Amino acid sequence: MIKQRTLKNIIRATGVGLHSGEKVYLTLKPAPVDTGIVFSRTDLDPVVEIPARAENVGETTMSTTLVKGDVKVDTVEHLLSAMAGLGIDNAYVELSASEVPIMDGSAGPFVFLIQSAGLQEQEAAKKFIRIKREVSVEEGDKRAVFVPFDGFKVSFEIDFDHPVFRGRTQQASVDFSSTSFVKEVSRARTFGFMRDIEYLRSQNLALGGSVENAIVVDENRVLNEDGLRYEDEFVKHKILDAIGDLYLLGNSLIGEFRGFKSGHALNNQLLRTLIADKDAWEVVTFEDARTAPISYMRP
Ligand SMILES: COc1ccc(-c2ccc3c(c2)CN(CC[C@](C)(C(=O)NO)S(C)(=O)=O)C3=O)c(F)c1
Numbered sequence: 001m002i003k004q005r006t007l008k009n010i011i012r013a014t015g016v017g018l019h020s021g022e023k024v025y026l027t028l029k030p031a032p033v034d035t036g037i038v039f040s041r042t043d044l045d046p047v048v049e050i051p052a053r054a055e056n057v058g059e060t061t062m063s064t065t066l067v068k069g070d071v072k073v074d075t076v077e078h079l080l081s082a083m084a085g086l087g088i089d090n091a092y093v094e095l096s097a098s099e100v101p102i103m104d105g106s107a108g109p110f111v112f113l114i115q116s117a118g119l120q121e122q123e124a125a126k127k128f129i130r131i132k133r134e135v136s137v138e139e140g141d142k143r144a145v146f147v148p149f150d151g152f153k154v155s156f157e158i159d160f161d162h163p164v165f166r167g168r169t170q171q172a173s174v175d176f177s178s179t180s181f182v183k184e185v186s187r188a189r190t191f192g193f194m195r196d197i198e199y200l201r202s203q204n205l206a207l208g209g210s211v212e213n214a215i216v217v218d219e220n221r222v223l224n225e226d227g228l229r230y231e232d233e234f235v236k237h238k239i240l241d242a243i244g245d246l247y248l249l250g251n252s253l254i255g256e257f258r259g260f261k262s263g264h265a266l267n268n269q270l271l272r273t274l275i276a277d278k279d280a281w282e283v284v285t286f287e288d289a290r291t292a293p294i295s296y297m298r299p
């Protein structure tokens with residue numbers, strides 16, 4: 001069968017929240033079968049746990065935020081993308097502060113630490129959410145779609161009137177039914193504009209943000225000394241974001257996601273819309289990895 005996966009070993013990372021600027025200690029732990037990804041504020045007494053599930057999304061403003069009462073876990077999308085990309089079903093994610101560390105602004109450092117620690121297959125069928133019917137949401141200009149697809153593939157298009165974007169509108173489509181995640185999207189960094197930065201810092205947003213953890217876009221140029229990891233790094237990062245927001249379903253997807261100027265807000269409306277429409281999806285397992293439409297890296 002395709003089996004559930006957890007961490008082989010505990011991972012510890014220190015970093016800074018992108019939005020909060022707060023210093024945060026991250027500990028990823030193995031978790032039992034069917035735990036899913038559960039975030040835990042270990043700075044609070046008692047400790048507050050929040051499953052990474054669509055129903056626990058609060059603010060979807062400049063990040064995906066999980067809420068339980070007053071308690072928030074901010075900017076989960078890059079870590080969850082890493083979890084989803086590597087096929088990790090079960091883990092505890094402990095944080096000493098509200099926000100996941102931004103690292104280099106990609107999922108790269110997370111996939112490096114996880115893959116260094118290694119993965120543990122568990123004696124239980126991995127569950128997938130299979131898209132059975134088209135499901136679509138639109139906030140005027142913006143579109144987010146699930147389509148039936150025998151595998152896992154993500155298409156995105158952004159279209160910002162800004163000279164940095166080649167003049168050519170950056171679009172990408174990636175099939176992740178095999179092992180393209182690490183190579184293709186893992187290293188694509190978040191990005192923001194010199195134009196917006198003083199106002200956002202006014203709203204206590206992007207306080208931790210620097211060239212060290214983001215693509216910083218001037219009027220006409222990327223400011224980073226070393227420029228871009230990829231020609232389409234911007235749209236690849238939007239794909240990384242979508243994979244993490246989609247993992248809030250709680251299981252890997254069998255289907256196609258298509259985003260059109262989509263962000264955290266619309267991604268979350270699409271999951272809620274999907275979850276409501278029970279004829280549009282079912283949960284499937286695979287007793288024989290050889291006939292499954294998804295394959296995973298050696299553990
Ligand atoms: C040093 O100068 C600057 C200027 C602007 C920024 C900056 C300003 C704002 C933002 C970011 C960076 C990253 N970031 C998150 C981006 C975004 C929300 C995202 O990646 N979410 O996962 S996105 C690409 O979907 O729009 C911001 O909103 C900075 F970090 C530094």
Ligand SMILES: [Zn+2]
Nearest residue numbers: 077190237241
């Ligand atoms: Zn992002």
